[PDB]
Amino acid sequence: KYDVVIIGSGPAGMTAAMYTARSEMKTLLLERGVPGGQMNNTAEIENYPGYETIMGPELSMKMAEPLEGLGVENAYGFVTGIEDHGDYKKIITEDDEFITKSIIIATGANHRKLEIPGEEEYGARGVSYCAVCDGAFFRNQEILVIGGGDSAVEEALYLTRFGQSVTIMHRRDKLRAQEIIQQRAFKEEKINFIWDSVPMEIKGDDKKIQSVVYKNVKTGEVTEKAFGGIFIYVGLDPVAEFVSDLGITDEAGWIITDDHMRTNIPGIFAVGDVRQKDFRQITTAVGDGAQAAQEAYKFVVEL
Amino acid sequence: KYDVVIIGSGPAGMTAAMYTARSEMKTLLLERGVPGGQMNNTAEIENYPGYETIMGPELSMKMAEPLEGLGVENAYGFVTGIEDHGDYKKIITEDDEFITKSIIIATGANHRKLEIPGEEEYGARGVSYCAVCDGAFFRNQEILVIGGGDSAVEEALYLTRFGQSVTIMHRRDKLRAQEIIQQRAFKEEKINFIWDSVPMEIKGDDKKIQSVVYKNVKTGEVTEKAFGGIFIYVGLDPVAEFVSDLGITDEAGWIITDDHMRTNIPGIFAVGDVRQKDFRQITTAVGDGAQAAQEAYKFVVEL
Ligand SMILES: Cc1cc2nc3c(=O)[nH]c(=O)nc-3n(C[C@H](O)[C@H](O)[C@H](O)COP(=O)(O)OP(=O)(O)OC[C@H]3O[C@@H](n4cnc5c(N)ncnc54)[C@H](O)[C@@H]3O)c2cc1C
């Protein structure tokens, strides 16, 4: 019935849908929340070719904008499962089922948790995974950022608009983030570093976080230090539970595709951050999405 | 000496350079002409995620703009050759030589010629390969567009601002272009079709084109018809002469890479339209370029 259903409306899904609709495929784009995916939790995007700098939610709106006009059908849906029935596929949401000739899975990735004491308990007051979301709650505080990659260092730099100070704690003595972002963090006077350390416990009173206990990974020295907020950026997990049984994921749960965005299962493609891959950016999300759309066309034509 | 030299400043090269410079690689971007590559010969770009519609040269300027500020060194150069010297590479232009640890080749593709009589002779008055370039020279004329793909049909639609009429001649009875563009061309009153036909000769007087002779590919009926201009969009050839001897091209001359933009030769990558591939778009140019930049970083770090 649908030619293609794209699940996920971040940049990978929104590029795919734009392309399948321009190929006049009957296109369903399901999104559980707000179009734009991780871009909505991004403050300042500087490396999307074609924009000098643009706030994550404004790029989201710009990418969502032509889709209605192109005839993509945009629907709310949280997908819980997919069944392959040979020459068609069934997609299960909370309340609905959809039938489609092909599927492009574009559901992205989610923050990994530390799994340390106080992490859940301080969920609402003190622990955050999203700085653009939560940052202004920590104006004038001592903020801790955990992680050494692009998200930790970038979101730390953003957070210096709010905090008295922002400390980045990394489990080695070299960051993983892009050098230009590393150099900005080194030079920013409001950013401090705790190198070679991992958080062990998040502590507080009944209401809120007050301190973090951490350990140095080369000496095992333990330190406890006061902070008002902790933002955790220790990497990603795939958002692909609705396909755990289909045999298209690796041991870590990322969806495996070839260079044409094809899984095992014909007519089921995956794009963007949910794929098994090393470089997760808006540019390669967009490129994956265009490549999946072109291959889904081919697959549906052939059917 | 350079960490990376990118050859070609269309969207693939300009994304790669933006990324290598953000990784603080010493980056040379050589371009023989104007930054933007084929985008500069494109009137209206509707499928670049993040823009509703944007003129090809304005997207070019937007993509070129942050590059100086990021420390990319932009240089004029026409590349004529490359030598692999194991742990460094030499790049030869008309007047200069450059030494670099890695190379990203992003030189794109060029219009294929019909190779029919009158084609060269009417080069300057009547035959064009670029409608945004030449279109206004044919105001009120009968324009002929040869080809059935995205470029022929899109550039025909553009050309209806100038011509009395624009006729698309395609060698089959089904276009290859995206359906949405096909439907626009079918509905546009200024667009006519000559189906199942190929041009055989371009004829004119001393000054300019006056007529085209063509043949129907199913019956061999020959027809000669008056036209003021002919725009030729019959596909692409790779722009990769400077590497013909390196053993990195297929029989047609396209550069062969794996899914990480690597050729045979380590530290030599290719991106975008010059690669052997099926889908040539700005989205996959941009994605190729980001992927090559990340792999060149890895390769230089390792060196
Ligand atoms: C803080 C931060 C800053 C970043 N900054 C940059 C940057 O500056 N430049 C850059 O290039 N990249 C950046 N990235 C990376 C970039 O945002 C991602 O690479 C990109 O958004 C991936 O797009 P995608 O469409 O694959 O997935 P996503 O954007 O993750 O979107 C997936 C969508 O799927 C939806 N979804 C998930 N499960 C379901 C379900 N079961 N049913 C229906 N819908 C579902 C989600 O709601 C979501 O909207 C950043 C990431 C972070 C966290």
Ligand SMILES: Cc1cc2nc3c(=O)[nH]c(=O)nc-3n(C[C@H](O)[C@H](O)[C@H](O)COP(=O)(O)OP(=O)(O)OC[C@H]3O[C@@H](n4cnc5c(N)ncnc54)[C@H](O)[C@@H]3O)c2cc1C
């Ligand atoms: C009429 C037309 C309309 C199009 N419209 C669209 C569209 O709407 N949407 C879309 O997504 N795609 C479109 N495309 C396709 C798109 O423009 C290309 O896919 C894209 O520009 C490829 O980028 P690239 O960087 O690989 O190569 P290119 O843009 O081709 O750039 C290559 C660059 O290399 C330079 N160069 C070549 N040889 C040398 C040398 N020896 N030394 C130094 N420099 C050199 C050239 O000057 C050029 O600037 C269109 C193409 C055409 C012709």
Ligand SMILES: NC(=O)c1ccc[n+]([C@@H]2O[C@H](COP(=O)([O-])OP(=O)(O)OC[C@H]3O[C@@H](n4cnc5c(N)ncnc54)[C@H](OP(=O)(O)O)[C@@H]3O)[C@@H](O)[C@H]2O)c1
């Ligand atoms: N500007 C951009 O283009 C941009 C912006 C944001 C994100 N992204 C992309 O998004 C993807 C994910 O980014 P990410 O930064 O969220 O994840 P990431 O690249 O996996 O990095 C996570 C960081 O946390 C470290 N880490 C893991 N556990 C830790 C712990 N317990 N304590 C302290 N540090 C810990 C990792 O250490 P090791 O380094 O030791 O593994 C790594 O430095 C990447 O591909 C990234 O490039 C891109």
Ligand SMILES: NC(=O)c1ccc[n+]([C@@H]2O[C@H](COP(=O)([O-])OP(=O)(O)OC[C@H]3O[C@@H](n4cnc5c(N)ncnc54)[C@H](OP(=O)(O)O)[C@@H]3O)[C@@H](O)[C@H]2O)c1
């Ligand atoms: N909007 C966009 O995204 C956009 C815009 C422009 C271009 N592009 C991309 O750029 C690439 C090249 O595009 P293109 O349109 O230049 O080339 P193309 O896709 O190769 O198509 C060339 C067209 O000319 C036909 N042809 C070849 N010789 C002919 C002849 N002698 N007489 C009549 N017709 C002839 C081909 O016929 P057959 O179909 O029989 O082979 C084909 O229809 C494609 O990947 C394209 O999608 C994209």
